[PDB]
Design a protein around this ligand. Structure first.
Ligand SMILES: O=c1[nH]c(-c2ccc(O)cc2)nc2ccccc12
Ligand SMILES: [Zn+2]
Length: 208
């Protein structure tokens, strides 16, 4: 049911997605171990993910959440990196896509910082790096991230350095409490609460 529509680099929509990708790169406390050493990306392609069934599954859930939270879905656009990006765009998010060992429990994790999601493209901790060169810092191989529409609803705030949501909440927010430059990360416990709206193909760039 999924079709992928290429965006032109001249399209304002390509440009706004690229800017969110580039402007939310940060340095990571692992010195680049997981995701590689880079300050910016070479964006190769941005595709719109179109699937009627998956979209309707998302909007149905979004209405349920909205109605449980004074008509406020608290919808964000967030990054997701995963070795399962191909399954996600065809079948939707579900429990197979959960980070069982995440710090907020077994749920599906999203990041404000594109570079945080980049650390998961090749697996937890960057796994063994790219398939071809086994390099977590590969500057040659093409990587993919999702830029996703995510319903947070009433989100449980965790100050910090599938399961169920905490009672009375629809998500968890991991607020950074040590690294002053880190942006928030978020967990949902229902696959229906996210839609994989853009598929971004890119390389990390070696700093000069
Ligand atoms: O983008 C993120 N992805 C993942 C992730 C972990 C395991 C897995 O099998 C698929 C994806 N974890 C994250 C944790 C924090 C922030 C972003 C992410
Ligand atoms: Zn490679």
């Amino acid at each position: 049911g999924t079709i992928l529509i290429d965006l032109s680099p001249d399209d304002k929509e390509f440009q706004s997605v690229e800017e969110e990708m580039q402007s939310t790169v940060r340095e990571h406390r692992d010195g680049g171990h997981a995701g590689g050493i880079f300050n910016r990306y070479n964006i190769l392609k941005i595709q719109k993910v179109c699937n009627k069934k998956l979209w309707e599954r998302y909007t149905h859930r979004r209405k349920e959440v909205s109605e449980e939270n004074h008509n406020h879905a608290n919808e964000r656009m967030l990054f997701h990196g995963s070795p399962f990006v191909n399954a996600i765009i065809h079948k939707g998010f579900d429990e197979r896509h959960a980070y069982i060992g995440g710090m907020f429990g077994a749920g599906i994790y999203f990041a404000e910082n594109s570079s945080k999601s980049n650390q998961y493209v090749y697996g937890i901790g960057g796994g063994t790096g790219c398939p071809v060169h086994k390099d977590r810092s590969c500057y040659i191989c093409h990587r993919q991230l999702l830029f996703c529409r995510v319903t947070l609803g009433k989100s449980f705030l965790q100050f910090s350095a599938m399961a169920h949501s905490p009672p009375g909440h629809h998500s968890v927010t991991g607020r950074p409490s040590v690294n002053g430059l880190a942006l928030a990360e978020y967990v949902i416990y229902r696959g229906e609460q996210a839609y994989p709206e853009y598929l971004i193909t890119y390389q990390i760039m070696r700093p000069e």
